[PDB]
Amino acid sequence: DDRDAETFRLRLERYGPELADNLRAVYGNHADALIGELLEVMLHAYHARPADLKRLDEARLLRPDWLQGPEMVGYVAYVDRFAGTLRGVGERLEYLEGLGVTYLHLLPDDLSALARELRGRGISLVLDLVLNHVAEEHEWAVRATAGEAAYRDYFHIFPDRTQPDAYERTLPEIFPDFAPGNFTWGWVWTTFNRSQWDVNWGNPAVFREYLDLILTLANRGVEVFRLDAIAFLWKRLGTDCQNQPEVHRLTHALRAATRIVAPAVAFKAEAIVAPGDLIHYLGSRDHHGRVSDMAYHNSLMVQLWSSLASRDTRLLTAALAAFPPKPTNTTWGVYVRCHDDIGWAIADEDAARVGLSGPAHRHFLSDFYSGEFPGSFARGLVFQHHPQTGDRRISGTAASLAGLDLALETGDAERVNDALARLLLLHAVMLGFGGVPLLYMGDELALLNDTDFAAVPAHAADNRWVHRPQMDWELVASAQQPVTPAGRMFAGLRHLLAVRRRTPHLHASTESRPLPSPDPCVLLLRREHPTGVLLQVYNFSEHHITFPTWPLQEQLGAVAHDLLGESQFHLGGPDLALEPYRALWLVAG
């Protein structure tokens, strides 16, 4: 067609110069020869792209903020732990749609079909894609061990280790006087496992290969790519070989190319680093909003559990205030739990600003969520003990960490009520923060720890399987005036989701900003959306607070309307009561 060729030409006149500039920046004179190749790869991908996905492309060019609407609800789940295979996932879609899920992150023909059904139900397929490394059994590695100098340059090989221990000087090692480093026998760069060979992004061929991979995967129906291990993909002598600027230039290139071939897809950078480093993944300088679309808001999560544990929200507001503003076209992925463990990412400066320490607060969080603290409701486990810092990762479901696990074995209805209120609180903060909320599978049923995880020998070692349970669809069907804990959690969350979908204020474009509070137990989050100021109030304690109305008064006026409880109260009277773990979404009433 002439229309398709013209469309492609227009997109290339748009995003082309971005793409060319970044490639010439990191490949120099090798850029031209690569550009000509990528042109062919893009053209092949573009003309092979199904018509319905082209319609999706056009649609997403009409709505570039599709990830930002308050209607977006995420759902992260292992494929086998959810429905065995992809076909079963296809068989369990009325449930997801019943929740309101539009963003389905599936953790690692059939896939194409599943994507088709998903789009049919208005759900975006989200897949992991590792950008840093491939297995040793992968084609490139096998071809490399065959002696082909072409496929050996896809990696980092070395004759004598005069170069390995040259990098190892600036490379962070888990232990000093030892050597569980980042190399494997020539000498092959292996930052993670012994069988995970790192790819050489200094070679244009691997860029081309990865772009082709992204595009064909996009043509299968994948709408959002979680770029796994994106921080390590560039390596430079004399550095930690992490978070290098070349990473963001390469990401910008990939992104532009994809914005030409497939406008409908988006990137979600998987990078669990400090905020100062993380903000670059949403693009700084010339990369501003021109790289990955999403990034994880890990800080909000660790601060959620932190504040829930300490009943004090000073550190949370502190850490949020020192958090850099994102480009308005990018969207945080927000969450309460996930497949991974919990690393207490707390800045010593953040703690210092609120008159705390840091290492002792990390010690606090670990002691609490492992169950060693007097008056702790947490029923979590210890995943790993950090070698010299002494930090501890914590495994456990949202429900067990929030106190329901302990509540049930000790049939105290008060403890149960409190636990459910805590969980609904956390989920309420997430759903009203701004960004696609990533419901971890099972949390809507308040799933408890799967302590029989050791029954599977493969899961026996890694105790993170205590919070990676198999989906019991009978439990699901039953939980679906609730009396069952799972039913009550399901109901509460359904309500929260409805209220979110309504509220236009929660558009991800506008960021939640922390407001100072008279009461440490109360968290105030201001969202200044064009339609009105949305003031969120949260009681992070089990106390019945008598809160002053003035902080609300000078924000919303004399009358306030609660979106969550459909209530409407006056802000003149000096005080109002906050019941344990109450959550308010206030607007001008």
Side-chain angles (χ1 to χ4, degrees):
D1 212 340
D2 211 341
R3 219 64 180 95
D4 293 284
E6 194 64 36
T7 290
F8 189 93
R9 189 184 65 89
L10 296 174
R11 291 181 188 169
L12 189 50
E13 288 178 357
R14 169 71 186 105
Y15 301 104
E18 296 189 7
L19 177 54
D21 286 17
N22 291 273
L23 294 182
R24 294 191 223 269
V26 313
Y27 292 113
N29 305 286
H30 264 63
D32 294 334
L34 171 60
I35 285 177
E37 290 188 355
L38 295 179
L39 214 176
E40 296 176 342
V41 181
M42 283 175 44
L43 267 174
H44 188 270
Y46 175 78
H47 289 294
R49 188 162 179 79
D52 64 345
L53 285 181
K54 284 183 185 288
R55 279 190 295 273
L56 222 220
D57 291 331
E58 191 165 339
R60 298 263 211 249
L61 276 161
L62 252 32
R63 182 86 59 74
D65 61 329
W66 60 280
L67 286 160
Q68 305 192 311
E71 71 274 357
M72 296 296 288
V73 176
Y75 197 85
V76 177
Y78 282 102
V79 40
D80 65 322
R81 237 71 220 283
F82 182 76
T85 50
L86 300 174
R87 307 201 66 181
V89 175
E91 295 177 358
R92 295 275 143 73
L93 287 192
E94 290 148 5
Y95 174 73
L96 294 178
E97 193 167 0
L99 268 177
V101 177
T102 57
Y103 181 100
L104 176 61
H105 183 188
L106 285 181
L107 293 166
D109 196 320
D110 261 24
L111 183 65
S112 320
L114 181 57
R116 171 160 299 106
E117 191 49 67
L118 285 170
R119 302 192 309 274
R121 291 178 174 268
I123 306 179
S124 303
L125 178 60
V126 183
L127 282 185
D128 265 81
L129 177 59
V130 179
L131 285 189
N132 176 80
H133 55 267
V134 298
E136 56 182 349
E137 51 186 12
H138 188 271
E139 178 183 341
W140 308 337
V142 177
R143 293 263 272 250
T145 60
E148 309 181 33
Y151 278 95
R152 293 207 319 173
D153 294 336
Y154 278 29
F155 307 89
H156 300 275
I157 73 111
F158 296 103
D160 66 325
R161 59 146 41 251
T162 180
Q163 281 290 92
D165 49 31
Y167 287 106
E168 287 286 352
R169 295 189 174 95
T170 337
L171 261 54
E173 48 193 278
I174 188 177
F175 257 116
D177 203 340
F178 238 0
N182 308 269
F183 288 95
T184 296
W185 184 265
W187 292 103
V188 173
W189 198 302
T190 55
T191 8
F192 296 99
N193 198 343
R194 192 196 97 94
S195 61
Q196 300 300 324
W197 298 9
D198 290 41
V199 296
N200 180 26
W201 282 89
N203 177 28
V206 83
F207 182 91
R208 172 180 53 79
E209 216 85 295
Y210 271 97
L211 176 54
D212 189 22
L213 193 50
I214 293 180
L215 294 179
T216 47
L217 273 170
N219 282 10
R220 286 198 187 112
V222 178
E223 293 180 20
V224 178
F225 289 94
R226 185 197 189 189
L227 298 184
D228 201 352
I230 189 180
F232 303 87
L233 60 76
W234 188 265
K235 307 165 197 313
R236 177 164 295 282
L237 184 135
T239 51
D240 51 319
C241 296
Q242 303 181 22
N243 311 322
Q244 298 292 301
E246 288 89 347
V247 170
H248 305 128
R249 291 166 198 162
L250 289 182
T251 304
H252 192 168
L254 259 348
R255 186 65 251 241
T258 319
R259 284 207 172 271
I260 306 173
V261 177
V265 337
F267 291 168
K268 178 171 60 174
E270 192 263 350
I272 313 305
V273 298
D277 290 310
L278 180 66
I279 198 62
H280 296 297
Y281 284 84
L282 296 180
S284 299
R285 308 290 239 85
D286 36 278
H287 303 327
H288 188 282
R290 298 179 173 82
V291 285
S292 335
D293 296 78
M294 302 177 49
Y296 286 96
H297 207 304
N298 211 83
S299 197
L300 174 64
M301 180 261 214
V302 320
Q303 287 297 333
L304 273 180
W305 293 102
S306 166
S307 284
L308 187 76
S310 64
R311 287 82 155 176
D312 180 278
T313 60
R314 296 285 172 78
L315 176 68
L316 187 146
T317 56
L320 280 192
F323 211 96
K326 60 170 181 50
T328 63
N329 60 279
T330 54
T331 305
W332 293 115
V334 303
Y335 58 103
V336 183
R337 290 290 298 103
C338 58
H339 58 279
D340 288 318
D341 52 78
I342 304 187
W344 303 120
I346 310 290
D348 289 336
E349 304 89 334
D350 288 346
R353 279 191 301 269
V354 296
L356 272 61
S357 57
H361 186 87
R362 257 166 281 130
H363 196 73
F364 186 6
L365 297 183
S366 289
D367 283 341
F368 190 85
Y369 288 103
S370 68
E372 267 105 65
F373 191 84
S376 174
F377 44 76
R379 275 290 182 265
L381 296 174
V382 180
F383 170 58
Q384 279 189 357
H385 303 75
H386 292 179
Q388 29 200 354
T389 160
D391 298 356
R392 297 187 292 284
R393 290 171 159 180
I394 302 294
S395 295
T397 64
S400 288
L401 295 169
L404 184 56
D405 199 319
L406 192 152
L408 294 189
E409 58 181 341
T410 73
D412 187 21
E414 295 289 81
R415 197 85 93 269
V416 171
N417 294 11
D418 285 348
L420 288 183
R422 272 189 282 270
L423 284 170
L424 290 175
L425 170 70
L426 292 175
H427 279 78
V429 173
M430 163 180 56
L431 266 47
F433 185 81
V436 14
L438 302 169
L439 300 171
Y440 187 49
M441 169 204 54
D443 291 342
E444 71 276 39
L445 319 174
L447 251 49
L448 306 182
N449 280 6
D450 200 330
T451 35
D452 281 34
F453 68 100
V456 182
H459 304 348
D462 202 325
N463 85 326
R464 290 180 293 172
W465 290 99
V466 77
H467 60 257
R468 299 172 175 171
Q470 246 271 111
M471 195 57 148
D472 189 316
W473 293 101
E474 310 306 315
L475 205 175
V476 170
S478 66
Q480 207 176 0
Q481 196 77 17
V483 284
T484 149
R488 297 166 61 176
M489 173 58 46
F490 200 83
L493 183 57
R494 274 285 220 89
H495 178 65
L496 290 183
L497 284 175
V499 178
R500 168 185 166 87
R501 293 189 232 105
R502 303 168 190 160
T503 311
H505 307 63
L506 306 180
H507 192 264
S509 179
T510 281
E511 295 188 68
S512 291
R513 282 294 142 187
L515 292 181
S517 174
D519 199 320
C521 292
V522 181
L523 167 66
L524 296 177
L525 283 188
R526 186 183 190 274
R527 307 191 81 259
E528 190 168 338
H529 189 270
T531 194
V533 172
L534 173 67
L535 217 196
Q536 294 152 268
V537 180
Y538 303 102
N539 177 16
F540 270 87
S541 72
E542 61 278 358
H543 300 112
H544 293 257
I545 306 296
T546 299
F547 197 70
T549 48
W550 73 262
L552 322 177
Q553 144 70 38
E554 68 179 40
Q555 211 69 235
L556 304 165
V559 174
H561 171 57
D562 175 31
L563 301 178
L564 284 181
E566 288 98 14
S567 177
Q568 180 151 316
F569 46 73
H570 202 259
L571 269 39
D575 294 327
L576 84 155
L578 296 184
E579 40 271 47
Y581 305 118
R582 182 74 176 190
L584 295 169
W585 290 1
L586 309 178
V587 302

